[PDB]
Each structure stands twice: as C-alpha cells, then as structure tokens.
Amino acid sequence: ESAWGPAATIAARQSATGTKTDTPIQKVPQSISVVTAEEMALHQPKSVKEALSYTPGVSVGTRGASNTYDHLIIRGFAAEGQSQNNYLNGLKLQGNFYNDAVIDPYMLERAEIMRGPVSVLYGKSSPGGLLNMVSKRPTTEPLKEVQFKAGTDSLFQTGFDFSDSLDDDGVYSYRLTGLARSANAQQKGSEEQRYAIAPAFTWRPDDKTNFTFLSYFQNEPETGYYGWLPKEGTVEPLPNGKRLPTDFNEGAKNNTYSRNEKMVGYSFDHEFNDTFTVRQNLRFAENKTSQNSVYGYGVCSDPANAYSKQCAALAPADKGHYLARKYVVDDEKLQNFSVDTQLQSKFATGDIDHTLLTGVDFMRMRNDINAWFGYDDSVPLLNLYNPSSHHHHHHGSSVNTDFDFNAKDPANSGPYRILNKQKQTGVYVQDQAQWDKVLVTLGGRYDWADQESLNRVAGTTDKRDDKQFTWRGGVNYLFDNGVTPYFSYSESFEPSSQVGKDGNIFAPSKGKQYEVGVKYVPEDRPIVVTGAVYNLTKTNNLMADPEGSFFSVEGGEIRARGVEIEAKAALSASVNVVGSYTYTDAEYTTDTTYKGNTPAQVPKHMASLWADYTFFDGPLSGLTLGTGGRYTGSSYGDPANSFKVGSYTVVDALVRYDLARVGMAGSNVALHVNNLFDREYVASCFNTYGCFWGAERQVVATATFRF
Ligand SMILES: CCCCCCCCCC[N+](C)(C)[O-]
Ligand SMILES: CCCCCCCCCC[N+](C)(C)[O-]
Ligand SMILES: CCCCCCCCCC[N+](C)(C)[O-]
C-alpha cells in the first residue's frame, strides 16, 4: 500500500553483496540484511548507521552523538585498527588512520550488511562482516524531488534528487542528487556542515548492456564532536556525586575537524549470450581530512595519567575530579583505486545447474599523513566540578577556551609523519550449484596483500607482502512452503600493520566461522524471518608481550558464539513491522592480559523492534504513525573488564502525512523524534578514559516535494 510496505519487503529479497551474483536471500548461505531506499525515506536516518538499526548482530551507536564515521562493530569485531570496513558498489572505500569516508544516506538506493567472514569474495576483511552501500542510479521514469528539513540544534537541510532520460528509449539517462546541511553538534561549541553532490549517468545501448558512471563529491568544513570522556562524570559519578552533562565538550573552542571526498567510477554489466555475462566495477577516489583537536584523556586519578606532571601536582583526593587532555593536529590525503572484474557462467551438468563465478579484484591505497600529537603535559586540565553543576545540566554547558595549536612544544609534543601504502590483488572462484531443492555454494579466493610504510620523521620503512587463501562453502535447502535451512563454513584474513619486537610487521589475523540457521522467505505473503546461530573465531590476535615490553606479540585468540534473529512483515495493509534480537557471547580465548574477558563495547544482549501504522480511511487518510524501540544490553568499558556501561532503551517515532491529498501527490511532510523520552545514557566506552554520551532527543521536520 504505502512505499515501505511489501514493495520494500520484496525488493529486499534480492541481493548480491553475499555472492557477487544476483541471488535471493534464502539462496544465500550466510547471514545478510538489506535496507531499502523506501525504508530510509521513511525512517530518515542521520547516517547509514541508523539505517541498519533494526538489524541483528551490529552495534551502530557505539560512539554516541558523534557522526564523524560510520563505524560498526559486527558480531563482536571491528577492523584492523578500528578502521571502517565499508563498501560502496562492491568496491571497498579503503581508508587509513583518520582518513575514512562516508556517504550520505540521501545518496543511497540501499544498504546491505554481510555478517561473518567474506574474504572469500572481497579479500582482507574483518571477521565480523562488511557493509555494502549502493549508489542511487538513474531512474526509468522521471524524478524531480526537492526536500527541506528544519530541526532541533539548528538543523537546516536542503536537498534534491532529479533523474531523467535524454532520449525516449532511454539508452541515455542521468541522476543528480545533492545536499546542503548544517547543525550544531550535541556538544557545546561544535558544529557540523555538509555539502554533497552525486552525478550519475547510465548508458543502456540495448538490453544486455549497462554502463553506469557513478560519481560522488563531498565537502565538510566542520565534522563535529569526536572527543573522549572519563567514565568519571559519565558512567560514574564525580567525587561530588554529580555528572558531566550530555552536551559537555572537553575540546578547545577552536577545535576544528574537516573532510573532503571526491570519487569517479562506474558499474558495468554485459550479458553476452545465455551462458556468459561479464561485469566490471571500478572506482577512483581522492579524499582528505584535517583537524585541530583537543581531546580528553581521563581524570588525573586514572592509571593512564600516572606520569602526568600537571596531574601529580594535585591533592591525591582531587586527582579524580580533574581531566587530563591532549591534542592532535592532522593533515592527510589519500588516493584509492579499485576494479573488480568478473565473468559469470551459467550452465548445467545433467540435473545440476551452475552459476560459476570467476573473477579478479584489485586495489591500491595511498595515504599521506602529517600530524603532531600532544603527550602527557601538552594541555591545561579541567575541573569537572563547575561543569558538573545542576546549573549546567539545566542552562547548558559552557564552551572552554582556545588553545594554541601552533606552539608545538617539543617538550610535551611531537610530530607524526607517515606515508602508508596498501595493494591487494585477489583471484576467486565460486559456484552456486542447484540440484533441485539443494543449493550448494562453494568457492575460494587467494590474495596478494602487500603493504609498505614510510616514517618520514624516523626516515624508516616497514614492509610486508602477505599471500592468503580463504574459502567458504555451504548449503541451503529450499522447501516450497518457504523454509530455507542452511549452514556453512567461511573464512577471512586481515594483515597487521603493527610491528613487533623483532622490527617486523606481524603476520595476518584470521577469521573462522561455522554458521547454521534457517530463513523463512515465503513467496506468497510479504514476510521474511531469519534465524541463525554461529561460532566465529579470530586467531593471531595481537596481544601483550608475556614479558613486559612495549611490543605486542601474536598468537592471541578471540571467540564470538551467538544467535541472531531478524524479522520484517506487512501485518495488514496499514501495519508494518520489522525487528530483531541478538545474543553475542564474545570471549578472549588466548590472551596474555585478558583470557576470559569479553571485549569492550559489545553487549551480550541487544534488540530492537519497529512498527508503523498507516491510515487510508476517515480524515486521517495518508497519515502514518510509527514508533520503535532500540534495546542495548550492558557492556564492558575496557579490555580489563574493570567496569561496566549499562543497558539502555531508546524510543523513536514519527508522524508522516502523505501530502498527496492536497494534489501534491508523491509529496509528504513529516515529523521525526529520536530518543523520544530524551533519555541520558552513555553509549559505550572503549576504555576508562574513552566514553561517549548517547544522543539526546532530536526533532526534525521534513518536507519533501515531488514535481
Ligand atoms: C579487465 C581489467 C583487469 C585489471 C587488473 C589490474 C591489474 C593490477 C596489477 C598490479 N599487480 C600488483 C597485480 O601487478
Ligand atoms: C523483539 C525482542 C525483544 C527482546 C528483548 C530481550 C532482552 C533480553 C534481556 C536479558 N537481560 C538483560 C535481562 O539479561
Ligand atoms: C525493544 C525491546 C525492549 C527490551 C527491553 C528489555 C529490558 C530488560 C530490563 C532488565 N535489565 C536490562 C535490567 O536487565
């Protein structure tokens, strides 16, 4: 009935991120979720992150109110370094250090999250999973959209989406999506600004051929808050019994953070005859980032400030209500090129049909870093006692003061100049073989992953080339009542970039996952229900030197066993629901300093559930009301597990009015409120000095008009 209904449910039955062939989800041997454009058009997520909010096995809010990155912890793990493991159009948006790129969800057609290992199809990748976003492409029918938004915290967004054919047959079409946004961050003194234009052009010379040029250009002068808060004044009280308020900001007042993104590429597909289709996906990007940032580093009483002179210089009983701060100045610039070429051969073997994928994937990334870091006594301290007042929780925080980012005292501060390079060439093969009600997926990939690192300050150079194989295989049994039981085994690998006591770069870490579960994907009614349970293991995790040095040592091992269930269904033509539940038991299996502990930021239990009700009768016709709940279980705030961050439940809702009924059909007006009950929670902590206030209640009005 309404866009995000079953038209959405069913469009999402289909995917490709999991097999690199266009396959429906019950024929996919691995856990995979899909979120459609109609859905983001309903929910209006600030980022790709919120877009996956009702999906299992993923924490999307770890960093709370910050929006700088779309970082996701999946099935308990994150990538080498805490780097994003994000794809756009099947190709990796490879970043490095603070140079990580994001794509606005207004420019997306869909997003898919693939859980567990997938090196079998993409190369070095985090066990845990990967995120694949898909660019809006030119439309068959015309589209002329203009959208306006006004919200709390001074959000003003203006954007458009126009697509048309240049000929009546449509061999030529384009799309141009753009947006201008600005708001002030939840934290006092921080703002956000974004400018983004995505020009796309499709060429279908006929119907067995498609070349779509995909481009994206984004400028962000200000990215906003990305600071660190002590568990003291957030999770826990300050010695005075109080807390830092949710809008508090430990940074300078002249803290500045910016990103620049430009990309050009294309998606290409050509079906030659009945057995041979070829597709090539390619992209080039040049992205940049800068920042001047003063950041928190815990209270003076925190182990991490043992050696801080401004901290030792205080009354023992004060140490725990004062804040050590550091800083960084960064300038970076990277280029990333990618091409994946694949040949799909469909054919039979008697009563056995095959879809045989064979392809070569390549990328190179270069990132040039030139920064400077304040060490132990590089910046003033802060008394969290004034901040802590009820005055402030009530009449707001107060900006701090400037900070000379140029006076770089060699005393307490240093330069960091690195030039990183990565290359990976992989060849993979896979077959989806179906013999009646059996679908068997199996293939493997081999990778040449080479890196090189130059340290311009030490004038030194670290290199390592890895050579890796990974494979995966599984079966999905297809029952026509709509029941697809499946299971499989899969792997992934990930090079280290760290260097050990012997002056060398450690070896790769690896991913090993056993998964089984079933998928209820009924062809008659608009419902999808999936359930899965899995054993995922990461080996060769870098750990602490059993012998007290400043180097890590390898051989560590972490395990995540878990359960995930997702469910989406139209319940009546006016009621739709979607929701999930996740159970993740993650464990340090082999570790110098932590066997038995669970890793920070990952809850044992999480869940979410959403419902929308649309009204087609009476005088409330074309009025949608929806509301949802997101449950985040308790979690540890440090590898030591010395403390815990608590469970929370945020409630979101909207009311949308289908303007249609005043002529303007296809237009609509909406009102969205996130964290309806304006709850105060700490999102997570990655350590005792690294904590994050969750997002305080937001209100946004959106008017989207279709000419
Ligand atoms: C159909 C075009 C395929 C392009 C393949 C790109 C080759 C990259 C070669 C670089 N390498 C390090 C492997 O020699
Ligand atoms: C739609 C499913 C809702 C599931 C909510 C699950 C909460 C499990 C809580 C376990 N607990 C935190 C009490 O230990
Ligand atoms: C949207 C699902 C909401 C589930 C809420 C679960 C609350 C569990 C409360 C018990 N506790 C967290 C304290 O263990």
Side-chain angles (χ1 to χ4, degrees), residues 280 337 339 341 360 362 423 425 450:
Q280 198 183 65
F337 172 77
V339 221
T341 318
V360 309
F362 174 74
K423 231 161 179 176
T425 299
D450 329 319

Side-chain angles (χ1 to χ4, degrees), residues 151-167:
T152 339
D153 290 301
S154 276
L155 177 48
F156 283 110
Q157 189 174 308
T158 199
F160 60 101
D161 201 357
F162 300 117
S163 196
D164 215 1
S165 308
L166 282 241
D167 76 290

Side-chain angles (χ1 to χ4, degrees), residues 149-332:
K149 273 174 189 310
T152 339
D153 290 301
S154 276
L155 177 48
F156 283 110
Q157 189 174 308
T158 199
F160 60 101
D161 201 357
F162 300 117
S163 196
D164 215 1
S165 308
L166 282 241
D167 76 290
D168 300 322
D169 273 286
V171 53
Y172 303 121
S173 52
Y174 72 68
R175 195 169 180 167
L176 193 71
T177 314
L179 77 89
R181 189 210 152 76
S182 78
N184 299 124
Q186 160 162 322
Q187 348 274 161
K188 247 233 114 84
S190 272
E191 328 137 294
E192 283 152 28
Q193 287 159 58
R194 180 182 280 187
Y195 301 96
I197 197 52
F201 188 75
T202 291
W203 181 45
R204 298 226 190 55
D206 62 49
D207 69 21
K208 287 164 244 69
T209 296
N210 181 319
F211 174 91
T212 302
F213 161 82
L214 301 166
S215 66
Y216 191 80
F217 303 88
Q218 177 176 280
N219 180 57
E220 297 170 282
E222 290 308 334
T223 280
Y225 185 71
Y226 195 58
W228 289 355
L229 288 193
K231 77 206 195 327
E232 287 82 345
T234 61
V235 172
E236 285 169 4
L238 272 191
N240 70 17
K242 310 150 169 214
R243 287 181 167 97
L244 282 169
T246 66
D247 77 314
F248 172 61
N249 178 1
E250 10 67 86
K253 100 160 265 266
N254 63 314
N255 251 21
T256 181
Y257 208 134
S258 74
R259 176 162 54 200
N260 198 258
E261 287 159 34
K262 337 186 153 108
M263 350 188 153
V264 289
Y266 58 83
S267 175
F268 183 64
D269 50 279
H270 179 172
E271 177 188 326
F272 282 119
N273 59 55
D274 313 78
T275 202
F276 283 157
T277 301
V278 57
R279 58 193 100 67
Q280 198 183 65
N281 281 322
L282 166 151
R283 177 162 79 247
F284 179 75
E286 172 154 282
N287 317 301
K288 294 156 184 167
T289 190
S290 305
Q291 74 184 276
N292 279 160
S293 306
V294 127
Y295 68 101
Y297 211 71
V299 282
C300 276
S301 92
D302 187 311
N305 302 311
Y307 314 112
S308 142
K309 298 160 180 184
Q310 299 154 169
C311 278
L314 306 156
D318 291 357
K319 290 197 214 314
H321 83 238
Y322 273 87
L323 177 63
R325 271 146 111 199
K326 306 201 172 153
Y327 80 70
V328 64
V329 168
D330 175 51
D331 182 272
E332 305 186 53

Side-chain angles (χ1 to χ4, degrees), residues 46-47 49-50 60-71 185-187 190 192 223-228 246 257 259 683 691-696:
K46 197 194 289 185
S47 82
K49 288 187 295 282
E50 298 75 343
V60 297
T62 293
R63 199 92 184 213
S66 201
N67 201 48
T68 312
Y69 297 109
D70 287 325
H71 181 56
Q186 160 162 322
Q187 348 274 161
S190 272
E192 283 152 28
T223 280
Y225 185 71
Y226 195 58
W228 289 355
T246 66
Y257 208 134
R259 176 162 54 200
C691 291
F692 310 110
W693 276 130
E696 60 184 51

